[PDB]
Amino acid sequence: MELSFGARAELPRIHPVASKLLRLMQKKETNLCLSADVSLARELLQLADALGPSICMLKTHVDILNDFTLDVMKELITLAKCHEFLIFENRKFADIGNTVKKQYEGGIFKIASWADLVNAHVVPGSGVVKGLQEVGLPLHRGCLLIAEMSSTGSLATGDYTRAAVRMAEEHSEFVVGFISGSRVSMKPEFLHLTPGVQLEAGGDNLGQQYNSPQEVIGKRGSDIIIVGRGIISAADRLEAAEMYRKAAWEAYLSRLG
Amino acid sequence: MELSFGARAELPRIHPVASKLLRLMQKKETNLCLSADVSLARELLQLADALGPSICMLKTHVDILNDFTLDVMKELITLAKCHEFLIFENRKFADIGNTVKKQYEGGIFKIASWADLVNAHVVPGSGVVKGLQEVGLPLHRGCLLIAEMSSTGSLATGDYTRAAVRMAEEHSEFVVGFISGSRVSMKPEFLHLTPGVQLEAGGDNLGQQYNSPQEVIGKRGSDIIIVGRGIISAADRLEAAEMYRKAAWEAYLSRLG
Numbered sequence: 215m216e217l218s219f220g221a222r223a224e225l226p227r228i229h230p231v232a233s234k235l236l237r238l239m240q241k242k243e244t245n246l247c248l249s250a251d252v253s254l255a256r257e258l259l260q261l262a263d264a265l266g267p268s269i270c271m272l273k274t275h276v277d278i279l280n281d282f283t284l285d286v287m288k289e290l291i292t293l294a295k296c297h298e299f300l301i302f303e304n305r306k307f308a309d310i311g312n313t314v315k316k317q318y319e320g321g322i323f324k325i326a327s328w329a330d331l332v333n334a335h336v337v338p339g340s341g342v343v344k345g346l347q348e349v350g351l352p353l354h355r356g357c358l359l360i361a362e363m364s365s366t367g368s369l370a371t372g373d374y375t376r377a378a379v380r381m382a383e384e385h386s387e388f389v390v391g392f393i394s395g396s397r398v399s400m401k402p403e404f405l406h407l408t409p410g411v412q413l414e415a416g417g418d419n420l421g422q423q424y425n426s427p428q429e430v431i432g433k434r435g436s437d438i439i440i441v442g443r444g445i446i447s448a449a450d451r452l453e454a455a456e457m458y459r460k461a462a463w464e465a466y467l468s469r470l471g
Numbered sequence: 472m473e474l475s476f477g478a479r480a481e482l483p484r485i486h487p488v489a490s491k492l493l494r495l496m497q498k499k500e501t502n503l504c505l506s507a508d509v510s511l512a513r514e515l516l517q518l519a520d521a522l523g524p525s526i527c528m529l530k531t532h533v534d535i536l537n538d539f540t541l542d543v544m545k546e547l548i549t550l551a552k553c554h555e556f557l558i559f560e561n562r563k564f565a566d567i568g569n570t571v572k573k574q575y576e577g578g579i580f581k582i583a584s585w586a587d588l589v590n591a592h593v594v595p596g597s598g599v600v601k602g603l604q605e606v607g608l609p610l611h612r613g614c615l616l617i618a619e620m621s622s623t624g625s626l627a628t629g630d631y632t633r634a635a636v637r638m639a640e641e642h643s644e645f646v647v648g649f650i651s652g653s654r655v656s657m658k659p660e661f662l663h664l665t666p667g668v669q670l671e672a673g674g675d676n677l678g679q680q681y682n683s684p685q686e687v688i689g690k691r692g693s694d695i696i697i698v699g700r701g702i703i704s705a706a707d708r709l710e711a712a713e714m715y716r717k718a719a720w721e722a723y724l725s726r727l728g
């Protein structure tokens with residue numbers, strides 16, 4: 215029997231980062247994650263402020279931010295706290311444990327110092343998780359494993375996907391869910407976040423493929439839609455965010471009955 | 472049927488970056504790539520200067536460099552030109568094509584501006600190569616595809632590895648080789664670079680596994696050894712690099728005949 219986001223937030227085995235997310239999704243009636251794929255700090259902060267009320271999460275892309283500083287991230291956190299959304303850094307960690315540990319904590323970005331959530335590929339084996347968790351657990355963070363991808367020719371299928379799910383299950387102190395195109399775990403403590411979402415059919419010219427909020431939330435059983443260009447390229451970004459939020463929210467409610 | 476590095480540099484279908492690499496490997500008698508996994512620019516540059524004569528390639532890890540600037544990379548390029556080695560940025564690109572394009576060209580790091588070689592995971596499908604190619608092609612850059620990984624539980628096996636080889640073959644205007652544990656393509660135009668190398672048996676506490684230069688070059692048929700901690704953790708990094716250089720070079724010389 216399907217549980218509401220509010221009930222899932224209270225499950226005994228729920229991770230605190232997932233509980234926080236689930237509570238604000240219910241409170242705000244949004245299961246929309248904005249993919250903030252922009253080059254400038256001013257654009258990032260303007261979108262976070264204007265769309266904050268409509269979103270549960272803002273997916274940053276610090277590797278493409280031309281004018282990144284840690285002060286930009288301080289200010290983003292203030293917006294996150296004010297508007298109540300989590301910060302999810304896009305960087306798709308995909309290296310050996312020892313390396314990802316340093317990539318997560320260190321460098322100029324210090325991702326673990328400001329990102330509530332990160333995501334990681336499972337291709338290196340479970341050391342990728344063990345390395346990230348060494349930094350993330352003390353910092354009270356969570357992680358998503360990339361169980362499926364939205365792009366043409368994705369190899370994250372079959373036994374690979376199943377490996378991601380086992381890895382997540384075995385590291386539930388840190389792993390809070392998945393990047394996936396559908397529900398891949400039957401355990402309600404895990405979140406499912408789906409990119410490759412637009413209202414209309416289509417793709418991009420570098421292998422991105424799109425499915426609708428109704429398809430992914432309603433038919434395929436995911437929890438959260440991640441949307442970049444569908445919102446950012448629109449003339450009215452606030453209206454676009456609202457259409458996506460309403461679409462994803464209604465799809466969830468219908469599945470809930 | 473085995474050709475020397477110098478002869479391979481003259482193969483008809485060889486990429487110019489691969490040719491430049493193979494020529495300097497032959498001239499300097501080195502098939503050693505230093506994995507410069509350090510957090511300070513001053514250490515990076517001191518290692519680059521001191522070990523430059525012993526290496527064919529320096530693998531940078533800019534995501535862990537706390538005091539990165541483009542001026543640091545300018546000085547690195549001077550040393551690369553002086554001592555004759557290529558610069559390989561470690562970041563294991565693993566996202567849809569439209570995203571990896573921006574990650575490669577942009578942000579603070581502007582990787583494409585200074586790195587001869589990049590590496591990409593093949594899990595997103597061939598869009599990952601297409602996206603990097605749009606940036607790197609005019610700049611005469613090349614790419615290695617991660618066909619196999621060194622870490623315990625690696626999913627880069629079987630049909631995954633075969634998919635990486637096919638993808639490299641179909642994008643030979645930009646893909647110059649592989650990160651792998653062994654020879655994975657029979658086409659001598661492709662480079663094989665192998666991490667998870669140390670003179671002694673063992674591993675680390677986060678899933679890394681080591682094989683020797685003689686096993687990897689000599690028996691598995693790889694071209695270049697990538698070595699981080701085996702060298703970086705020594706008291707005398709120069710002496711360590713020389714040991715690794717002689718091991719890898721003599722292993723190559725012996726498989727030649």
Ligand SMILES: *[C@H](C)c1cc(=O)[nH]c(=O)n1[C@@H]1O[C@H](COP(=O)(O)O)[C@@H](O)[C@H]1O
Nearest residue numbers: 249363364409410441442443444566570
């Ligand atoms: C990573 C979250 C990911 C994984 C995937 O399989 N597909 C993806 O597209 N993404 C990321 O999500 C956004 C998608 O943005 P658009 O809505 O296509 O503009 C990108 O940031 C992509 O890297």
Ligand SMILES: *[C@H](C)c1cc(=O)[nH]c(=O)n1[C@@H]1O[C@H](COP(=O)(O)O)[C@@H](O)[C@H]1O
Nearest residue numbers: 309310313506620621666667698699700
């Ligand atoms: C990426 C080059 C890679 C791929 C892999 O399968 N295994 C790896 O270890 N690496 C990278 O190579 C160095 C290994 O350093 P050590 O010799 O183990 O210190 C790391 O930089 C790793 O990310």
